[PDB]
């Protein structure tokens, strides 16, 4: 409730579709796959 | 929470010796986890010369998190400026909101060898109404002398377990009661222990 | 006199009580802290110590 | 799988290690005591049996014997505890200490005069209150800051020869310490 | 193409001892029971340490040229003080003087026993005034140290 | 095929020489070691 | 009144050998009538040496046989053989120790032939065909020959005249030393460096060829070093001068002042210091302080201080060297000699002394058997009036005997 | 060796002694304690 230390330092927008890059890939079909690497996380280290 | 918590305080002199016949009182504030609190009624008692420890008992509601008590001495000769006061804080036990308690706080007083003792346990607010089994371990001198086990039935909310005492537990002992539950995502077990005199 | 000259030993169980690994009477914080205060270390999948 | 064990193990002592299972419709388990080398050492190996009669809990005693490497920078190499089971496997280190047994030094008199025999006996004990017959050395320290050392092999009551006060005694509070001198801890102190 | 064709590097493999990969700090400094006692005259305390244990006794020796007479031992008292037993240093031999490089002093030896006289000169030209022949009886030689002789033309 | 493939090992010695890196500076929660002067200056210098 | 006490030295570690000591029995003129003088004797067993760390291997397999660096190649073999002989450890290899010893002796013979090939007609020592004469390499070869002296043989006449050549030519009247083969204070620094190097060489080669002229040269050089080391010039120069002075007289006032200054200039890490080293440059193939650390280690080993040597041994065991030294082997042989002296001093502290205290004209009173387990002794009263003589056999270790005199004196 | 967790007969006892633990087969690495009779 009481979120101190300026959470997210007023950083609003992430990259547009980084989930597409983080998503899986297939070589024999040339079609992308489901997300594997969760890039939506931040680990606390805000990088503006 | 919800169970009367005994308070045993001792008064010692300047050089490592207990004092008796000195009336003492304490002020406690039972705080709520949700909102504002109220002041608990003070209690005053005297310390016995033969026992050396003053006995106190306070009953608290089920929604208390911590308590702070200021034990002060009361005597006709001791003024208010020169008075003995020592503040302390007691923190209760959880992610699954489950608790466990063992009772009678060794005030029997301390028991002998050969007589069976009953101890009441209570799994207040468990993860599920159905509990697999009861598990308790009595240890002494840093070693596990015996391991106990019981079953949980819906006959009552609190069950009394019988623990036989042996000759290897004369100086002191400890017992811990822990029960495991099966969660929907992750499990979490709750334990508790009280000294054995 | 010997500042009282207490006794030769006078203590067999009081000095034997030092075998207890943990301190205090009992009870405490979450299972890890109370087991460390009681003098034990648990190994389970749910929680660590 | 809840495994309960003491926080500090004792070298040369029977430490009972208990294990509990959540329950299933009878697989065996195995626990062992390994040194700091994983790879490649093992002190002892215990085995238990799980069934519906025991309700899938059992306890086996473990011992820590003088198998440690002689010498070295530190002889602790506390412990590496492993559990061999069909459904689970986990390892964890636990601190240990050579603190095993107790030493009760019993003297005949608290006050001594010059040129007087010193009758003293040491009570050797184990963690299980057993005699634990072991060799013990006894050192004497002058109150100003060592005087004589003597060792004797141990019945349960270690008898020592009568010490003699030097011709020029130093009045004050003396000191008596006793050690096993081979591999142990918990030095006893008498005054 | 541009660049170098030869690279001449060093190799001796002088590190024969192999114990293990160590971890290093950033930088160090010079300087961050009974303490170190104050020795008697001529000092010369052996096995110098920072702190001595209670009950440990350390022997002190006399600095050259002297000799230990009496009881030379310092035992650590329970408190921070020392026993400071009766001990002194008596000169057994006198040492060669470091006044100036012009000598070539007769006789030229490392040490001289009490009763031997020594003579210094300024070769090969003029000489400096002062005591030419002086003996060491163990009585704390007092020659000048800056303007000892400084023989002028 | 992968250039270098790493597998679980049987370590003769576990981790060692673990200590606090910061001596006269501040230790950030993420591991960064910055000067104590940079603390309480209205700027996120640690990153978290 | 204690009035008496000595430290029994079996092998003569500190100063001269001290194994037999006579404590005369005297009667003061203030003795009370009908009073008997009482004496109590005991031993202490001060301490033992640290066996912390001593490692040296892979030298025989890497560089044993593999233009002008034939000397650089063959010199460290002598020090490796010396370390192997001192440590008395040959069971590490599967091969028999005798075959390895014979191979090392053959390599030492090859090195002796090589160092004989570097001898010119003027008895000097040069590097490149003998075109110019160098005193540094001459003293290095003198060190090598002094190391060889202890094992097989060396011709004395070829060393005495070689030292006389240096004493006659390269010895300045002030005590300085220089070489023919080639910031005003840098000249004095190099002069003191060469002087300390020549002092080390002449002291190593002096035990086999004792001469009055060589002793005079040593006295003059020691005077030069004690006079000119007053200012703090450089850590490396200070350390090499301290070692050159410790190879001779170890209890000189100015030598002790130099040792104290070097200890003040020492660098430590931790409290208590786990590692102790010396840095040449202040506030500064890149490790150049290893030379001065090895020189300070040798100086401390000459003082027989285990507590002060242990951190330097831990430093030279594993550190940022990697390594990491010059020339080589100006520092490699110094570190090998330091490890050898450390192992030798550890072997010196064994406490195998067998103390048998007896009377001069009467029978023996008591006998002490000192071991590692029993490092203490029981007090024994002295009743019969006679001269007491404490003595021991060969022994190995270090222990001090304490004896006090209790006499009733009026008063 | 398969990511761990994925015999000796009864030892003879000397004269006037007895083994604390009795068993047909003992696993490799297991230790036994010997005891002496009264007297």
From Swiss-Prot, chain A:
Subcellular locations according to the entry: Secreted; Target cell membrane
Biased composition (Basic and acidic residues): 2-13
Domain of life: Eukaryota
Chain positions covered by the region annotation Disordered: 1-24
Disulfide bonds: 9-46
UniProt PTM: C-, N- and O-glycosylated. O-glycosylated with core 1 or possibly core 8 glycans.
Assembly information from the UniProt record: Monomer or dimer; as a C5b-7 complex it can also form multimeric rosettes. Component of the membrane attack complex (MAC), composed of complement C5b, C6, C7, C8A, C8B, C8G and multiple copies of the pore-forming subunit C9.
Disease: Complement component 7 deficiency: A rare defect of the complement classical pathway associated with susceptibility to severe recurrent infections, predominantly by Neisseria gonorrhoeae or Neisseria meningitidis.
Family (UniProt): Belongs to the complement C6/C7/C8/C9 family.
Task of the protein: Component of the membrane attack complex (MAC), a multiprotein complex activated by the complement cascade, which inserts into a target cell membrane and forms a pore, leading to target cell membrane rupture and cell lysis. The MAC is initiated by proteolytic cleavage of C5 into complement C5b in response to the classical, alternative, lectin and GZMK complement pathways. The complement pathways consist in a cascade of proteins that leads to phagocytosis and breakdown of pathogens and signaling that strengthens the adaptive immune system. C7 serves as a membrane anchor.
Name of the molecule in the record: Complement component C7
Organism: Homo sapiens (Human)
Gene coding for it: C7
Shown part of the complete sequence: 120 to 167 of 843
From Swiss-Prot, chain C:
Coiled coil: none
Domain of life: Eukaryota
Protein's UniProt name: Complement C5 beta chain
Shown stretch of the complete protein: 612 to 660 of 1676
Swiss-Prot record, chain E:
Subcellular localization, as worded in the UniProt entry: Secreted; Target cell membrane
Region (CCP 2): 79-153
Entry comment on modification after translation: All cysteine residues are assumed to be cross-linked to one another. Individual modules containing an even number of conserved cysteine residues are supposed to have disulfide linkages only within the same module.
Chain intervals for the UniProt region annotation (CCP 1): 11-78
Residues covered by the Sushi domain: 33-91, 92-153
SS bond list: 34-76, 62-89, 94-136, 122-151
Stated role: Component of the membrane attack complex (MAC), a multiprotein complex activated by the complement cascade, which inserts into a target cell membrane and forms a pore, leading to target cell membrane rupture and cell lysis. The MAC is initiated by proteolytic cleavage of C5 into complement C5b in response to the classical, alternative, lectin and GZMK complement pathways. The complement pathways consist in a cascade of proteins that leads to phagocytosis and breakdown of pathogens and signaling that strengthens the adaptive immune system.
Family label: Belongs to the complement C6/C7/C8/C9 family.
Associated pathology: Complement component 6 deficiency: A rare defect of the complement classical pathway associated with susceptibility to severe recurrent infections, predominantly by Neisseria gonorrhoeae or Neisseria meningitidis.
SUBUNIT field: Component of the membrane attack complex (MAC), composed of complement C5b, C6, C7, C8A, C8B, C8G and multiple copies of the pore-forming subunit C9.
Protein name: Complement component C6
Source organism per UniProt: Homo sapiens
């Amino acid at each position: 409730e009481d979120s101190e230390r300026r959470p997210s330092c007023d950083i609003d927008k992430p990259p547009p579709n980084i989930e597409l890059t983080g998503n899986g890939y297939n070589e024999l079909t040339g079609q992308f796959r489901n997300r594997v690497i969760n890039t939506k996380s931040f680990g606390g280290q805000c990088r503006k | 929470p919800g169970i009367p918590y005994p308070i045993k305080v001792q008064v010692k002199d300047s050089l490592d010796q207990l004092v008796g016949g000195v009336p003492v009182t304490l002020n406690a504030q039972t705080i709520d986890v949700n909102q504002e609190t109220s002041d608990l009624d003070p209690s005053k008692s005297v310390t016995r010369v033969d026992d050396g420890v003053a006995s106190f008992v306070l009953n608290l509601p089920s929604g208390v998190t911590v308590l702070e008590f200021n034990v002060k001495t009361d005597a006709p000769d001791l003024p208010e400026e020169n008075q003995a006061r020592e503040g302390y804080r007691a923190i209760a036990y959880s992610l699954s909101q489950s608790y466990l308690y063992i009772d009678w706080t060794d005030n029997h007083k301390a028991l002998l060898v050969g007589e069976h003792l009953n101890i009441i346990v209570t799994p207040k607010s468990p993860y599920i109404d159905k509990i697999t089994h009861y598990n308790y371990l009595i240890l002494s001198k840093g070693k596990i002398i015996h391991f106990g086990t019981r079953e949980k039935f819906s006959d009552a909310s609190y069950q009394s377990i019988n623990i036989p005492v042996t000759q290897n537990m004369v100086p002191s002992s400890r017992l811990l009661v822990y029960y495991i539950v099966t969660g929907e995502q992750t499990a979490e077990l709750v334990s508790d222990s009280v000294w054995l005199n | 006199v010997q500042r009282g000259a207490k006794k030769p030993l006078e203590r067999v169980f009081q000095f034997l009580e030092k075998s207890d690994l943990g301190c205090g009477a009992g009870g405490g914080l979450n299972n890890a802290n109370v087991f460390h205060l009681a003098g034990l270390t648990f190994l389970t999948n749910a929680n660590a110590d | 799988y809840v495994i309960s064990a003491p926080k500090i193990f004792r070298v040369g002592a029977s430490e009972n290690i208990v294990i509990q299972v959540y329950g299933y419709t009878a697989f065996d388990a195995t626990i062992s005591i390994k040194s700091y080398p994983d790879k490649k050492f093992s002190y002892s190996s215990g085995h238990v049996h799980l069934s519906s009669e025991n309700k899938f809990q059992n306890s086996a005693i473990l011992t820590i014997q003088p198998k440690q490497l002689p010498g070295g920078q530190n002889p602790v190499s506390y412990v590496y505890l492993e559990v061999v089971s069909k459904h689970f496997s986990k390892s964890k280190r636990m601190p240990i200490t050579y603190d095993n047994g107790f030493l009760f030094i019993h003297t005949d008199k608290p006050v001594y005069t010059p040129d007087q025999s010193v009758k003293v006996r040491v009570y050797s004990l184990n963690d299980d209150l057993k005699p634990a017959k072991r060799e013990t050395v006894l050192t004497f320290i002058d109150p100003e800051g060592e005087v004589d050392m003597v060792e004797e092999i141990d019945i349960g009551i270690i008898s020592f020869p009568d010490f003699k006060i030097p011709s020029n005694p130093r009045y004050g509070m003396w000191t008596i310490k006793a050690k096993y001198k081979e591999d142990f801890s918990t030095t006893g102190t008498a005054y | 193409c541009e660049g170098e064709k030869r690279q001449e590097e060093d190799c001796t493999f002088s590190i024969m001892e192999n114990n293990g990969q160590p971890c290093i700090n950033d930088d160090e400094e010079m300087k961050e029971g009974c303490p170190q006692p104050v020795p008697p005259e001529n000092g010369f305390i052996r096995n110098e340490k920072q702190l001595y244990l209670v009950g440990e006794d350390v022997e002190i020796s006399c600095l050259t040229g002297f000799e230990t007479v009496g009881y030379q031992y310092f035992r650590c008292l329970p408190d921070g003080t020392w026993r400071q037993g009766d001990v002194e240093c008596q000169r057994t031999e006198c040492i060669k003087p470091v006044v100036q490089e012009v000598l070539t002093i007769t006789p030229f030896q490392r040490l001289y026993r009490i009763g031997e006289s020594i003579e210094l000169t300024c070769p090969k030209g003029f000489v400096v005034a002062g005591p030419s022949r002086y003996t060491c009886q163990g009585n704390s030689w007092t020659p000048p140290i800056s303007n000892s002789l400084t023989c002028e033309k | 095929a992968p250039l270098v493939a790493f597998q679980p090992c049987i370590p003769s010695k576990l981790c060692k020489i673990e200590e606090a890196d910061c001596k006269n500076k501040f230790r950030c929660d993420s591991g960064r070691c910055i000067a104590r002067k940079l603390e309480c200056n209205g700027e996120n210098d640690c990153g978290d | 009144e204690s009035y008496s006490g000595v430290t029994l030295d079996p092998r003569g570690i500190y100063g001269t050998i001290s194994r037999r000591k006579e404590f005369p029995y005297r009667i003061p003129l203030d003795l009370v009538p009908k009073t008997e003088i009482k004496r109590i004797l005991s031993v202490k067993g001060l301490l033992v040496g640290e066996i912390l760390s001593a490692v040296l291997s892979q030298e025989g397999i890497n560089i044993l046989t593999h233009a002008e660096a034939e000397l650089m190649s063959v010199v460290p073999v002598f020090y490796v053989f010396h370390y192997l002989e001192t440590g008395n450890h040959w069971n590490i290899f599967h091969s028999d120790p005798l075959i390895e010893k014979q191979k090392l002796k053959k390599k030492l013979k090859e090195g002796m032939l090589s160092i004989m090939s570097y001898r010119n007609a003027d008895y000097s020592y040069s590097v490149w065909k003998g075109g110019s004469a160098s005193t540094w390499l001459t003293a290095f070869a003198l060190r090598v020959l002094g190391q060889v002296n202890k094992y097989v043989e060396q011709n004395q006449n070829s060393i005495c005249n070689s030292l006389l050549w240096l004493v006659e030519n390269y010895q300045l009247d002030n005590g300085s030393f220089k070489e023919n083969s080639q910031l005003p204070v840098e000249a004095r620094e190099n002069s003191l460096y060469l002087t300390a190097f020549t002092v080390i060489g002449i002291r190593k080669a002096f035990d086999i060829c004792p001469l009055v002229k060589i002793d005079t040269a040593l006295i003059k050089a020691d005077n030069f070093l004690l006079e000119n080391t007053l200012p703090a010039q450089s850590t490396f120069t200070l350390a090499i001068s301290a070692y050159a002075l410790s190879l001779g007289d170890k209890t000189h006032p100015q030598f002790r002042s130099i040792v104290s200054a070097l200890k003040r200039e020492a660098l430590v890490k931790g409290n208590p210091p786990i590692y102790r080293f010396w840095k040449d440059n202040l506030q500064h193939g890149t490790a150049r302080m290893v030379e001065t650390t090895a020189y300070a280690l040798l100086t401390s080993l000459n003082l027989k201080d285990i507590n002060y040597v242990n951190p330097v041994i831990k430093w030279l065991s594993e550190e940022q060297r990697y390594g990491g030294g010059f020339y080589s082997t100006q520092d490699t042989i110094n570190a090998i000699e330091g490890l050898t002296e450390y192992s030798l001093l550890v072997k010196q502290l064994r406490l195998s002394m067998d103390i048998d205290v007896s009377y001069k004209h009467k029978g023996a009173l008591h006998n002490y058997k000192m071991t590692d387990k029993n490092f203490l002794g029981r007090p024994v009263e002295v009743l019969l009036n006679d001269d007491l003589i404490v003595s021991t056999g060969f022994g190995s270790g270090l222990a001090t005997v304490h004896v006090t005199t209790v006499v009733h004196k009026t008063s | 060796l398969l990511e761990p967790h994925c015999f000796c007969p009864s030892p003879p006892a000397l004269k006037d002694g007895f083994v604390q633990d009795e068993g047909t087969m003992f696993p490799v690495g297991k230790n036994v304690v010997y005891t002496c009779n009264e007297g």
